[PDB]
Structure 1
C-alpha cells in the first residue's frame, strides 16, 4: 500500500544519495592525487625550461 510503497522509495532514495556521497568523496580523493601530479609537472616544466 501507500505507506509501504512510500517507505520503499525513501529507502531507495537514501541509498542512492549515500552512493553519490561515496562517489563524490572518491572523486575528491582522485582529484587530490591529480593535483600533486600536475604540481610536480609544473615544477618539472620550469626545470626542463
Structure 2
C-alpha cells in the first residue's frame, strides 16, 4: 500500500500534467496571439 489513495493520485496527477501543458501552452500562446505589443 501507500498511505491512503495514491492510485487516484497518479491519475489526477497525470491528468493535471496534460492540463498543465495544455494550460501552459494555451497561456504562452494566449499571449503570443497578442504578440509583444
Please state which band the TM-score falls in when normalised by the shorter chain. Answer: 0.5 to 0.7
More helix per residue: 1
Q: Which runs of 5+ in 2 are unaligned?
A: none
TM-score normalized by the length of structure 2: 0.64
Q: Where has structure 1 moved over 4 Å in runs of 4 or more?
A: none
TM-score normalized by the length of structure 1: 0.53
The higher radius of gyration belongs to: 1
Q: Which runs of 5+ in 1 are unaligned?
A: 1-18
Q: How many residues align?
A: 31
State the shift of 1:20 in Å.
2.3
* Aligned alpha-carbon RMSD (Å): 1.6
